[PDB]
């Protein structure tokens, strides 16, 4: 023994209390919890606008070389990546690309004006376009083209306009929902989602996008679904008509994918400055345009392309305020999923470097971005589908990177539409698939969790299967609920243990864990590694009698039958402990004379009324048997709420408390020794 | 100090491990977990049939006087109580009373043959008839009476038969569901419901029944509902047509209620043997029959009565096996609610005396009872609505009480129908209301929980409002989920505390709690009374920096700015702890030189990957600041899963563990003293 000598007396509970006194419990009384605002405090409003507008630190505090170069490179890279991504998302939405461009341009600006994140390429997300198509098919008629008077071979431009309008309304509704959420300071909801939730959910997103791209890789017009086996029905529909349909589409897709792999190899083997300091993909766009125009293989197979790209911009407009009635549940589900994914992405980036991000600010940012896009004839967007990860590699220090990006995209679209008016619906698909595989290759955590624990497997897999098959919103909600159920199970099946004693110490560990530990006569220890709420209550009593081996009802019956077999030849004026009625006869079973029971509570977080009742029953029962029970851990809450419940008649129950396990041990030893008379 | 002298050396973790060795970890390997059955073990099958058929202890082990008298008195009392209850439930079901009698008779018998409970009067439950009417109105047409050819003034006997058939099918489906549940050994679901759940849920049941009786107290034929404000819409419908409708009904109801109160007073003031050792109500039946027949006030107001009571019994029949398709969701909801209420009642009785009840046995009992009643042209039943409580007061020792009861009811119905063929639909209502007030008068736990805790209020009230307004099934499910949410909140907002030291002891308690406790220099203690799962994680770090006052980022910024202001005038070859870069300058803030941080984990039940990551971050961050961190409670699970996660490079991180808080205290003291060189 180098140190740690105590020589302190025995403290059960009352020794403490009589040795102690409460201090004051001073608190902030009524009306003193608001005496900060309601005046012209420049500090208060200054800090409020600081947390609302993070901009107030950017231009005043900016670099000259590193910031500029990082912003430029990151913005150009993100824009070149996301432009085909925007096109693909718009075509998935079955809207002309111009709306995708609007989403890529305006909300980026409203975010650069609003949002505390730094390294994130805010843009449209895929499943968003997925539910866009889901509405466009469910709430929007597909094969009912109302004759306006022209009856074109495809007069669906009116149906497309209806799609635009319904997306407009739903995006506005989602934006206002997000704004209302933000003004209520929701960060609690941000943390309820786990890390495996985010990871598996992104996996399901990737597989859904993969399915959609495979469908739109060849041009088979089938039904779109959003229900049970929705992706399954989509893929079987694609399969049932794939044969001898298009070969130019597959050929161009495979060749562009090979070009993309060659670029992967070129930028991955070496990291230089002259050709490209950043792995890009625009040369694929260049070659696709060249093949379509100069080589002119469109008519060589009569293959199709993106089509026409309306050149110009649009004035603002508001959605019609008489149609939101029926489109309510869809809108709210979309807002829920949009926030879930966005704030998830937000935290999963903010956790990275020496910077933190308050979600509520990002929530109001996204709410305003969606509402404004709706006003600006645009659909709502999300944090990222994979580009934000690209943004990470491109070191987008400040938010000016995304601003300059979106400005570059707007300049390109307005000053040019012809150079890319003729691109197929497969090159963008291959780009999307490249991004998907890039973002999924590391989605092989299954061994990590497998070596880690079962529960991570459970939560991962249930999220994956619920989000993939069922609706992304339904998958999300079920996944969150089942994560909470994982928590309750973890605290439902604890690890009951029976402690021993480390010789000549006050340490107590489970006997099954080691051989060096010993036991103490007449004494049993039962440690619980979980609280006792209503649910995790009675099975605790069962496990107690089980591991301890002392079934007190068995004791009573054995005493009764043994005496039968021998027979053939002043306010609570109550004792909280009986004695042994056995008159010391030779019909005793070979049961050890364990006399006292000790339950560790140092690992008990809280307690509750059902638990109070069951502990009272257990204690009274053992006392009736004539077996002592002692409780270790009389700290604050356990005693507080046990006293709150009608548990004590100021009895020796108080004496049954012990602050230390070993303190209880020695108290019991002393009690037994005194009992020796 | 009387005892408790230790003088034991310093044990962080490795001192333990090098001082210890694991024992064996022997387990039951593959194929040895089933070597009990698959042979002709008379013990195994004997005990199996014991737990399946509790009867094997009743006739062989029976008394001669006490059992007989208790069974007789309990059975007669329960039967006389439940017979009008059965009539009321049938009329609520809008079926002729004969079906209520079938429910009162057959399933009681199948239970007396199956079920380990002793003191319970198994019978029909009200809300069951409520959802019966709900189906009879929703899935069964109400005002569409198909002309069969006779076109009577009320040809609805065919519609009533349709009601009977649909109840028949749904009861069969619920019975088979319960049986399937039972064979899967469900006791987990039994405990997930709390005590306040049961109490508040019964309150809502009582108010619903009260509403129904008030409606059928005067004969206003309105619409029945099962949705939002269902009871509210029912009661407003009743109110909108109540005026000058019936006065004989209210008069007879009030007079019979006064008779019931007089009986209450007579049996409550004294407890004798000659007039009635048990408070009964049959004299109300006698007087109602006398008024209807001899006094003959029916035509005096042209008031109505129960009607005709078909005399006789019925042969068995099975439901049509081509209609269960559409009636699936309703059937499953009914089975869910039936088990919930029944097993709740079962536990709430089994907990009472020296007897325990395994629910799965009761689940298979109820499943077979429902299925058989369906086969025997009968609707399914439940444990009780209030009579079981009567059964308690009547000391129904064994299950023969209910058997003799149901036999008495069958004898009365078959040998007599005329003596009660003419009874109004108000006397039974008053009886039901008497039972309801009897069962609710003690449903004033609100002060009990209010003095107890907030959480009980939350759970009680949410159950009450969800079950009353929304559907009883929906109310149930929402109530259970919100109870689990109460658990997660309780472990989401812990009680962070900062421990001090009891002078010259190793005890450590919160400083805010008492004045006698002191502090230890350069040392801070942060105790958590809740685990660290994914959710309850980052706010923990926040509260740490908050209560401790040591914002390490603040420390870094302060050091940086202070030095700026001074300036104007081999495998993991890594240190897990930095030092102080401050060169001891007079620009230091007046911050205390607290050098080490100690986090109690003795109250930490478990850990998880998100928590692992956040602890790693916190530790690394403080080490970088140059502040030590030590962990108390290196018992089993925390170290186990921290090691499982990529946490240790076999570094001094192991040395950062401590089995005892005070052990960590002294270790830090020693480290600092050694640092003094």
UniProtKB/Swiss-Prot annotation, chains A, B:
The record marks 386 as: Controls the electromotile activity. It is found in: Cell membrane. The keyword Cell membrane applies. The record marks 387 as: Contributes to anion binding. Residues 493-673 are annotated as: Extended region for STAS domain. It catalyses: 2 hydrogencarbonate(in) + chloride(out) = 2 hydrogencarbonate(out) + chloride(in). GO terms for cellular component: plasma membrane. The chain crosses the membrane at residues 68-93, 98-113, 126-135, 167-196, 197-218, 250-271, 280-291, 327-349, 359-376, 385-394, 399-417, 425-447, 456-471, 473-486. One of its GO terms (molecular function) is secondary active sulfate transmembrane transporter activity. Its main location: membrane. This is Prestin.
